[PDB]
Amino acid sequence: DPNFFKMVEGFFDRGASIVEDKLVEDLRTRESEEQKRNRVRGILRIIKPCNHVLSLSFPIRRDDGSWEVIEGYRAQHSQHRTPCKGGIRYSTDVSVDEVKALASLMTYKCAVVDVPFGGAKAGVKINPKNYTDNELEKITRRFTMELAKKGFIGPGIDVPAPDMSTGEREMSWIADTYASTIGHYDINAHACVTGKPISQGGIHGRISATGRGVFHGIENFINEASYMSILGMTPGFGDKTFVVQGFGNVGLHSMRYLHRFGAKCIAVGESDGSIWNPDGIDPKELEDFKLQHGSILGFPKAKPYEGSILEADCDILIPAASEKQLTKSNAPRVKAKIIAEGANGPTTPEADKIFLERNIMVIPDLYLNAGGVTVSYFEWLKNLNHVSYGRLTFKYERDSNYHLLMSVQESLERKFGKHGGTIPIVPTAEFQDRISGASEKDIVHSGLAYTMERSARQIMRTAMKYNLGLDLRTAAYVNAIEKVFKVYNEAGVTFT
Amino acid sequence: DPNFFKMVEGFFDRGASIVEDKLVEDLRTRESEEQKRNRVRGILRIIKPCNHVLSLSFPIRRDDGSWEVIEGYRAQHSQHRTPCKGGIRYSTDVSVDEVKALASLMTYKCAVVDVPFGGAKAGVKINPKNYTDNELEKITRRFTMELAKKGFIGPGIDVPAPDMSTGEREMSWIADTYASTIGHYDINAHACVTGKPISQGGIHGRISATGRGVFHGIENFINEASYMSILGMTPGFGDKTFVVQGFGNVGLHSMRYLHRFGAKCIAVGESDGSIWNPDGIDPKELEDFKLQHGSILGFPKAKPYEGSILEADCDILIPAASEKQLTKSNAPRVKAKIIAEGANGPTTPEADKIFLERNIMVIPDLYLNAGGVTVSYFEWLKNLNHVSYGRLTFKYERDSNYHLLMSVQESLERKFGKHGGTIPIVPTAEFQDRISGASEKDIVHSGLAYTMERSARQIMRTAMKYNLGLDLRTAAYVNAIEKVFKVYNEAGVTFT
Amino acid sequence: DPNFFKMVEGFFDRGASIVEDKLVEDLRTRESEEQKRNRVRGILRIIKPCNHVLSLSFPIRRDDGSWEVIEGYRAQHSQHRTPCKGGIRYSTDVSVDEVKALASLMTYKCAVVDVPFGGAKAGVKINPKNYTDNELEKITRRFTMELAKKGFIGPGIDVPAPDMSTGEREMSWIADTYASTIGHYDINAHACVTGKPISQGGIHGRISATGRGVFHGIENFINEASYMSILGMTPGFGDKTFVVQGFGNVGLHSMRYLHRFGAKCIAVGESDGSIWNPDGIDPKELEDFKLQHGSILGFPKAKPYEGSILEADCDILIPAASEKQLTKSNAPRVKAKIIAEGANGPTTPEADKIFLERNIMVIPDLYLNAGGVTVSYFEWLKNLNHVSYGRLTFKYERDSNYHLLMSVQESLERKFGKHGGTIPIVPTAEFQDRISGASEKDIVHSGLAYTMERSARQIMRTAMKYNLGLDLRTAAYVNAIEKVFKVYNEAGVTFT
């Protein structure tokens, strides 16, 4: 198996090239001055390498009065779009190369869903398990101060975020330290990081963010005829059946919305055993089980399905867990026609070829799980705005809606000696709930849906542009590379 | 009678305690590590004391070439939420304790209506009457410079506002001085203060702001069954009758909207005599009278009601004037079942008990007159946005509304050989006015309504949460204390 | 006994008036336009009141996981001269009035010795004894952050310093916190406070600073004929005999230099008993004793002198301890002709009159112990310079000195068939030590001496200017008031 560094490096190169010819030709060779347009492709070579990478060593006084000196890293791949956005990982295996790689992905991931940020990513070579929360707060804050002093953390410079290793606690600590030290004068000091609790400037619609992204990503393609044709999908009996490997936030939430929209969750997966049931596993129940006690293991109404759920027969298989699960090994034995990468990097470059060869459509991690980045862009915006979405309009809207309905009523009653007989004024219960439950998550999820869709359409349009097939992944990176190149293109370097 | 310092100090303590137990238990004792959660209640002790208080002495050269050295104060209760928001009072009785007290109230008042600001408050020990406008401008600007230099006036630090003693002139002077000196480089320099004239960045819907707040506050409770049951309200004959003590902006405007919605204004009050009329005093008229000449005294269609209107028999009595009017003295002789505190602090802690005992529902100053703070939050926002609300959408909306209606028409005419026969396209006159008069105040008032309501529901939910009765006041402060504690809770102190 | 507030307030007023007439007349009434020069004395009224006073309340988490919320204050009397300079006191009795008062003194004290700073002073209502060093570091740093955020601690704004309650630890903590948070970008961040250890940017010659000040202060007057005439001093047998009440840094060091210059230390004092010996107590010994074990109590070669050393018969009595020791009570029974106030405020306003009446010359605290402020001005300077005094010149100088001597030699040998016979080249041992021990303290002490002297001469010149007698104290405050008035005078207020 390869390493993200090489995988992404490859993903990049592959598209960089595909892009090269087209990009130069019909696109800009129009005015082929000296035909040295092939030389102006120097943009791509500037684009590829993660621009700046900071490596720290800083101490914290462990609770037992002793001194430990922690080491961490933070790379900012591109500032072609201002606040570099990216997570912070606390794990003993984080490496400049890991960070260097992921930071790259992030710029491409952001471009795909049109999020105005450069990619960045951090790692503090630490094992949270080995530390008291007090020591964790100390590490995060000291880490922040350093990040802040060398230009790797401000609101308009770099805006970190959690990673499976970190969370809203760490995010709150960071925001706080920045806003009380280095960012004291900044009116948007609290925008220095996203992923914070609601009480500290967080945005509603955050947790489910990543899941809905998976949901909407799969949706946009699954309602696409052409795509579903090549797969023989949109079946009369096959219909909708999904197997979710991994039952965390994303896997959990994916199972929820996929289901809420008429999909049958036949089998769910974990780190221990698996589960099965052709009749359908209910999201809520399985959720409450996993909450009421440890794993989903022994879920009543669940036959302990044994074998890799990856092998399971279903239409859509969502690896919402562990890196590279789909490999050349099991790739040829998979039964699903759609591989929606809920997890970051669950299929190896080889497995891709196999799937490609046997027409298994794999919806790319780059696009599929970019829903979280999408909502973070919204938090940052929330932080800059200094107000929650819909705070000033919900009521205004409620009023106008009612006016529309009352106008239908009044106009219709003018076609009778009516005065209270035709009652449109009454909104559907569904609209009634919506009305009575107007809140941020609403606006947030709308934006998410709008981005996931507008982007799906873009990725599709490029597949064709670049005549790629069900090779959504390279269509994606290409879509991104084109975008990143464009910003530079309408500038340059220093003669930018 | 007590002093706000003690009153508010008390109000605070009372809730702080009620909150303590609950807050710790089911809420966070879940993970009672060392059960030293009772120690983490140190948050409350940090919360109580007004954080910083600045006291100045600065000179101005009185018009007669002489030098006077004015003294003033500004306290910032909490920065747990960034721009401390709060007024500036010019009166010879302003005191560090007064300011210290009011600044506290402000943080709680803001939390109640979910306005993201810490409480702050100022006082310049001066009597405006004794000074020429030129001297007032000099005092306000010099005051501002000082405030600015010690961190008590920036847009992202502290944003002052008027107080009965000060107004949009002073507000304009301030904004101006800050924006031309200390705030020269600030793109939001004009957000340093709210309450400014429209031509200087003010917001429309400001004046009536406080009145509508009173209106909506009373409304939310008056349409609440359960509440009105305990009072025997929502009467078949009693219905709606209010007596407004005090006829200033707030009292004026309260009388207007209460009335506009079917309430009978039986008697209005002033500093001189009073007025009466069981048949109903019209807001507009009484308004024009008070404008055309001095007091409402001798209002035609008004029998000079003599006695304290507080004693008057009506359903709702709104003290929109002088501090502590309802005391243990007259408390037991009041006839109203609802005491809507339009004024800040019109009922003493004792009178509260009496009312409580005899089921008179008193809607708290903390919540009831927070409508002004609400609109100031909107001004500040308008200032940051650099645009008036609805500037870019009114037309877009007008268009879509018309499309909705034209779609109803077209769809309905497809159920006939119709082509211009069924006319829904015609909006109700009411909707027609709304359409033709789209402007900021609209959006502003909507936001106000949305906040007053969402908060009323919150206050109600906590009353029950804490099993308080028609003790809306302590339910309020509790609601606030909970909020303020939460922000700290998801942070700390230094280990914040 | 009165309180510094009133005492200093008085000291101020007294001189303010003396100054008024003269200051206006021959000095500026030259061009008596409208003769409203008496109105331009508004300067004095602006001068008197401590300009700004900040009062905090901030928490620290006491070592036992609990939360305490500490309260402190910092007043800046005048910014007529930029960095307000002033100490920080940790004691449960610090009060806005105390701070307000002392901050005033500081501006006058600084003016006297021509130190370009406004007076400021702080107090953290805390008892160091009740806290662990870790808690003290927390309090000092948090205190600093607050001070920093409201404009009461930067290098070019306000530069705190120790007070008997605080010291170089606290000073280091402060400098450090400022330089790592709020002052991160400041190249002179470390100049935010004086009194720091040498390793953190401190200056050499600091500890003894206050003592030498006392020494030089007494000296300048004691070598003054006219003064010593009125006292019958500069005696043939009486000569030099001093009694030092209080044996701390200042009392210790005063005893040292007074002695080193031919003064007989007859009796030293403490908090317990006293000591006596007409033959002379040796500074070093008494020093080592007080170090080797507790108090000076039972000093071999010391008869436990019992009674107030204040009553002791000696020429010069230095109260280098406790506030107001010399009162109307014992004033008339004192035997010394010179009262050199090593301590801040050791004689009451009444006692002054008595001494005045009986020609006891009291050298004012304002001037006499300003030696420490003097050296702090030098630390701050050292901090701005980014180099130690004499670092670049000592060697250059050594060289030139040797050239001077070698030129004397060579020139003298040209008046003989000499070549190595006349040897001036040889510097006196004393000059040899000086040469071989060249270091900062040298330059520091020189500056101290130069200031103490140039100021003594100034104070003397004003005594006469204002025809004051051996009323050095009011001559001092007058000297200061004149200075402070001049800076404003060549500016104004806003029309400054």
Swiss-Prot record, chains A, B, C:
Any GO molecular function: NAD+ binding
Activity regulation info: Subject to allosteric regulation. Activated by ADP. Inhibited by GTP and ATP. ADP can occupy the NADH binding site and activate the enzyme. Inhibited by SIRT4. Inhibited by HADH.
E.C. number(s) listed in UniProt: 1.4.1.3
Protein name, as recorded: Glutamate dehydrogenase 1, mitochondrial
Residues binding NAD(+), per UniProt: Q79, H80, R81, D114, H190, K382
Reaction catalysis annotation: L-glutamate + NAD(+) + H2O = 2-oxoglutarate + NH4(+) + NADH + H(+); L-glutamate + NADP(+) + H2O = 2-oxoglutarate + NH4(+) + NADPH + H(+)
Modified residues annotated as Phosphoserine in this record: S17, S66, S165, S322
Family classification: Belongs to the Glu/Leu/Phe/Val dehydrogenases family.
Primary location: mitochondrion
Record note on quaternary structure: Homohexamer. Interacts with HADH; this interaction inhibits the activation of GLUD1.
Active site positions, chain numbering: K121
Result for mutant: R256T: In HHF6; diminished sensitivity to GTP
Modified residue annotations for N6-succinyllysine: 6, 22, 48, 100, 121, 129, 138, 284, 290, 301, 303, 328, 353, 395, 415, 418, 441, 465, 483
Root EC class: oxidoreductase
